[PDB]
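dumping the sequnces here before i forget
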Amino acid sequence: ARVTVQDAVEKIGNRFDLVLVAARRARQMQVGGKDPLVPEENDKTTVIALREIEEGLIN
Amino acid sequence: LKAQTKTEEFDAIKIALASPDMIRSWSFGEVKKPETINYRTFKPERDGL
Amino acid sequence: FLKPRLVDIEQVSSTHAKVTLEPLERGFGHTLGNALRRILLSSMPGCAVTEVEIDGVLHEYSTKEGVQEDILEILLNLKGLAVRVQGKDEVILTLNKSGIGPVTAADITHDGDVEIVKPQHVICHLTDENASISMRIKVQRGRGYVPASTRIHSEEDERPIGRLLVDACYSPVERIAYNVEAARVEQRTDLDKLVIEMETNGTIDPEEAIRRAATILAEQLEAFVDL
Amino acid sequence: TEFLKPRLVDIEQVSSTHAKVTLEPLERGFGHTLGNALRRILLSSMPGCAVTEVEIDGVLHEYSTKEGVQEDILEILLNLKGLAVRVQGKDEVILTLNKSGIGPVTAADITHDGDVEIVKPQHVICHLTDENASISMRIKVQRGRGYVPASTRIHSEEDERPIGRLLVDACYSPVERIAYNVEAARVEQRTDLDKLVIEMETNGTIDPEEAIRRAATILAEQLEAFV
Amino acid sequence: RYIVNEVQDVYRLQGVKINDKHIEVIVRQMLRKATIVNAGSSDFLEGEQ
Amino acid sequence: RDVHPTHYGRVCPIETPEGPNIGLINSLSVYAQTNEYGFLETPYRKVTDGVVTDEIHYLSAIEEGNYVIAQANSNLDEEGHFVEDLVTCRSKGESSLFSRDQVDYMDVSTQQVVSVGASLIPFLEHDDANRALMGANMQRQAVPTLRAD
Amino acid sequence: EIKELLKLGDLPTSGQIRLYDGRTGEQFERPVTVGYMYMLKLNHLVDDKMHARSTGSYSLVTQQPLGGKAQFGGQRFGEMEVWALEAYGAAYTLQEMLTVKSDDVNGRTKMYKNIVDGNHQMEPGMPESFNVLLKEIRSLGINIELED
Amino acid sequence: GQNMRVAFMPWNGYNFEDSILVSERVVQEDRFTTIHIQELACVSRDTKLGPEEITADIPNVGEAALSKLDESGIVYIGAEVTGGDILVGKVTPKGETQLTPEEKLLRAIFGEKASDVKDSSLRVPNGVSGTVIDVQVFTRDGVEKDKR
Amino acid sequence: TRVLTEAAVAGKRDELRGLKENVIVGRLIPAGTGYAYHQDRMRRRAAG
Amino acid sequence: GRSVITVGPYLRLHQCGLPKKMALELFKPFIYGKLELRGLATTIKAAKKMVEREEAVVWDILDEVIREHPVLLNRAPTLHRLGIQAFEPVLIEGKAIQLHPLVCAAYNADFDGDQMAVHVPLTLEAQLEARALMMSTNNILSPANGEPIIVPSQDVVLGLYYMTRDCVNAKGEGMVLTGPKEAERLYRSGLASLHARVKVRITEYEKDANGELVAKTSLKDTTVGRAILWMIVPKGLPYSIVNQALGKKAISKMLNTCYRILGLKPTVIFADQIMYTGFAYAARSGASVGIDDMVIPEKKHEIISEAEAEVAEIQEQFQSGLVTAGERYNKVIDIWAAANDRVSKAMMDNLQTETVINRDGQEEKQVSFNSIYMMADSGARGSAAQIRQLAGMRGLMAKPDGSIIETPITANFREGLNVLQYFISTHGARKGLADTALKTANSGYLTRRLVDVAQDLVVTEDDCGTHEGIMMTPVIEGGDVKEPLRDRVLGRVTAEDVLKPGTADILVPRNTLLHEQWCDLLEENSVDAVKVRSVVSCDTDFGVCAHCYGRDLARGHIINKGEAIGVIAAQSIGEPGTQLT
Amino acid sequence: VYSYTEKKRIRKDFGKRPQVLDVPYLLSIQLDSFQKFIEQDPEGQYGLEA
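..and the predicted 3d for all of it:
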């Protein structure tokens, strides 16, 4: 589980458009799109997107 | 940059005054008979509301 | 190291006793003290009223001609029955009583497996001359605290609508507290002793009590050993 | 009575620092009767060793310094309390520490006896300046149980008439801190269960895995006269 | 600066420390009206933003 | 909503439940008797210039605030008469000092002043009465137990 | 008077006796005031107000809230609580709270039948309230305009 | 209320003034139990079509809904009524406005009350888990009801 | 009513900008991501 | 939905605890979507029946959708922005929302009946703001200044006073220590007293460099308490701050420097661990009350007796004709108040050092172990002034007319004071109650008109164009500074280049992000005039620009462009508005 | 002094003021008004008669 996502806040400073990014991304992981690369572990796709921001691979 | 020429989000509303013609643009019928019922058959009066 | 062991169990009564442990090493008076205390305080095999069918019952909240309290409060008394079984999973105790007198725990159909420890335990009274009561107290054995409320969602398909579901309080114990003091053996520098003052209404023998608890700890440690 | 068998045991091992042992299921007073159990066992009775007795040569004063070492002599001694050792066939064993040269006197400069099991030779006993400096000390690891004081258990040496004994509180504990988390656990269709998540840290003597194993065996030993 | 010194004074009996920007946001809105004094375009007494 | 010593003996500014109907209650007393029309009479013992007679009287709010009456805190002894020669008395509703040769009344019993919810609480003089106000509310909500020890 | 009574035989004149902690058996420092006192439970048994309701049935004619104090209860979201939402940096929950989460009768239906299927993102739509004000001004002579 | 053992000692967390630290004892022994009886009732017959029946049965339901309702349309007193079980079977004359094309003619030739009637009973309000106790019913003055 | 006519009388075409405005209608206020759209709408309004 | 809050100690700082079944009723929707996504459900109808049967299937799925759900714990009646925060629900067996104690300071609540509602984020939008800008562990700052959301203000901090307590009666006081780790293990067995003064070899970090915390060797002498403390302190925090007397606001600024010098995360871990240890020592310090723990001063009764025959002397000086009847009252008032302050001069020395114990020498004087003293040191809830008027004479109150009692209460609440005087004290009760009651209502209405006028103020521009601002100065009135320079400037933007006691050397260029470091400069220089720009002088049309507001926000960085400020200010002035009568 | 029921349970009375006037029916004001209300009244007792 995550205790501090301040890292995500720094990779993408918008903190708003950031939500629109993961917005369309959650859409891909649901309605066709593409499969979630990082093998998920209980964490819904919303949190999975959170993790992808911290790594900064998909923005 | 250049924006989108397609519908993406709502916009600003202009509130001033409009002409009676502007109004009639949405009229799709003229109500004639004022009575809303058929009295006998429990049914909606045609040519009415 | 001298193996942990209990000396002669200080028996003052059949219902309540206090185990005494002499060969306790540094800290075991407290180790086993609480390692047994908690289990002894909750999970223990007891016998409690599950379902009872009384005859004169339109509804459990009725005033039967001849009894001081509710029909359900008759069941309230039945909730803490001091019955002791020998092997049955469940057993039916018939209670029939007609005549001027307090319906004690002696007028019940005394079955061989049903061993009430306190015969004079008055449930309810039957004071009217020409009145009568007749019921069947279906008591079973379990452990812990299990209520018919958490069991009421099903109805269990009841044709004999006299089968009222009541609270199964499976706790023979009531008073478990441990004390400590200087224990002296012949070969050792310092040992601790343990005196667990346990109270049981009269369903499980004091030794069988500490027996079951210790055994459950053994099984709850089964899986805990594998890394 | 009802019986539920242990299921799902999450061995969350870190191999060195600690281990979080999850276990199911623990009914009313089981995450308790078992959690408390381990705490006391780990802080009262457990085979562990560490340096207890130490003799430099004669100058044993708690606030003095010996030319060659920049630290105080007493502080050298607490570094010894940290030295993790474990003898299993002998009670108290006497060694010798001889080192002379530029560099910190690590625990890898001691005479390594069979009984003595220095798991962390890296632990510097005392820093040594760049010179010859013939530092010497009769380091002496002792076997013990959990955490017994060396302030009351002071042996009969140069302690009575004179003053030349600085025996420190040897860490006989293979543990450092105990913690636990109890949250709602379940059984497919049972009511409320507790989840036994015991967190235990070791000092560096034994690998947590077998430590949990050693502990479980000893509790079963406490129930050898019961179940 | 006196208003913030006076209302904060009240807060001195209250032992409160406020980032003064806020007390002033309230004050700025109370001064949204700028009575256009000199004769010009709008009017001679037209109060505006 | 103010309290005044002229309520000592009939009205309880103390007892007034918390919630919707607060402040506007001021309870009726146990020794209180609603007059034939609208008044209320308060039981006071007639102390005639020295001897406290056991004759109980019924006064109004006008007469109470018109005569010198003693509180329930008036130490009598051996005979029932004032052992002292001075006592705190309400002349018009003000607790002041009066001579024994002037006092005309004294409160009958320590209860001839409060209500059901006031008298019910032991040692009211020691705990605050606002807690009795809140306590007033709590009284009319006591829970039904099965076996009442 | 109290004390006179307690010395008759041999009693705890000082109801502040020393307590043995049942957790193990140690004694606490400075014996405490312990004994029998009197409690007073009220009629406030939460089972008269704890009638859980968050999602059920709303009104027919309009967006009318049907519920009282005991049964069928629900948190009253008012215009002042609206300002609370308008007071925090969280503008997204604000959006929800006055559009799809608490406005459109069609908005929640059209979205609930999709969250039960799973899709983490929503779309506004058209608030019927506007549809009232909108046509109303049309009778007067006002034009709504949305271009590009 | 009740008088019992009370001690004064802070535990940092479990008793901040109003927070009371209670021991299993009470709730476990029914030494402080309160009893609660609630009341419900069903409005009567008369419809623009005809009379009504207190069910006298209960059409097209599961096994449970039958083992409890007798030929009077009432639930067996002393049964298990929790959550939202059926209590009183209430019949309601469907009506002209509801009739259907593919069903007509049956109730025009075959009989009379073999279809026009439906089932709109009443159930246990969410939040109740007890036992139906007293039942008092009354019938059609002048022109007697069914077997009831 | 009064303020309604107060603006209508002259025709002060307020583009429905603001908090409370977008509150009653139920749309994005020019704040945070809402203003994102609004800056793109700034360049979009009264232009072509 | 609605719910009550409770303890639940084991819950970490970033996670709250929701009750099993209540959680079910509210997260049902997501369960359905998740079920037909993983491959377990058929249709929504089939899924409803799954929850309908308590399927072991949904239980595992329940774990998956709650154990990591950034939720909004919103309290509707909040007259403040930071009253709406976020946490992480956990499968907890209970009937209430177990909350982490170190957050209650922010909510200004306790554990005894606080009603809160739990809002479910239906879209990732709400979810992302939830753990990002709403999370407790992610916004330990206040829009008023540098107020750390996370701070021990309960007996948990009093528990820490038992930690950093210092009495001479301590076994081990004299030996030396080289390891903080074994110090904690010295107490885990409970041998050397936690009050033992031991010479400790500590490593202290202080980041004065560009990306490097220069450390240094330091030998100090502290109790085993602070020794144990040090073991979990993030490098960024200098030893100086933790070596003190330890108090409510003291431990408050502890974490404040810790954050304003190092960062967020180290503070998170910090807070949690202390919480657990704090509670341990709080238990060991059971503060008792009831008749048995209160005391009476040997000087109280004598000074009252002095001022007793003394007023009897004034009674006689009235029968003689030296003072007027009115001047008699006020004079008596003065001397009883004089006796009142002398009652203070008694119970304070008494209750601050009378406890003496011998160790390593003769009986040394140690701070009273009396719980009243510990309360008057760190503090939790309740003023030691009313406590003062519990063990000492209450003094004077208000009369049924309005003035002040001419016949003071000379008794104390340790004993049971008299009917009549307490009956006049009954009038005092009246007073208090009523006031609170109505003022709260009209105060919220005050903030109503406040927001009614400031909601149009949202930050819409980046840069304005004004070189003007206001003169922020430490308005020193009377003696020492009252309203400082730092807490009026902290969080804003410099209006213009401010100077040092020296000219032609700027300490804060006009364009600067004003925070701790720059405010530390405002404090170490002779600067008295620091002009900081505000919205009142903002040139921005229809709003304010980012460069005019500053960095003040849930975060300590650039203010969002579209961040409404006028609204959060009405709230932030009406907040103390409730504190006004 | 002691009646049929006082044979089983007695409350320790302790009054400081030797009384002459003893406690009456607790709910006087209420119950006796009911008696005046619904009864045969030949004159005009406050109740149905007044």
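The two ends of chain C are 27 Å apart (CA to CA).
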